[PDB]
Amino acid sequence: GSSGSSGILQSLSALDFDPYRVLGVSRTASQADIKKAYKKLAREWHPDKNKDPGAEDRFIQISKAYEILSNEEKRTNYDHYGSGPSSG
């Protein structure tokens, strides 16, 4: 059996890009999992060692994804909105 698998599943994001999806974690992930995942991604995908064109892009995002969660104020805000339409 050379190959055989399927995973047809649609999706819909609330904002330009989701933080959890960027960092690569789920709701179950807590400040701990997210944090470690952030630094780990920032260090590994760090532009300091990365020379190939594009690496930076990823990093710039990875940092942004966490910036939201990492921050208490930012994190909470999201929850309040419940991934819905902003008041204004």
UniProtKB/Swiss-Prot annotation:
Q: Where in the cell is it found?
A: Endoplasmic reticulum membrane
Identify the residues that the record assigns to the J domain, covering every copy: 18-82
Q: Which domain of life is it from?
A: Eukaryota
Q: Which cysteines are joined by disulfide bonds?
A: none
* Purpose of the protein: Plays an important role in regulating the size of autophagosomes during the formation process.
Protein name, please?
Answer: DnaJ homolog subfamily C member 16
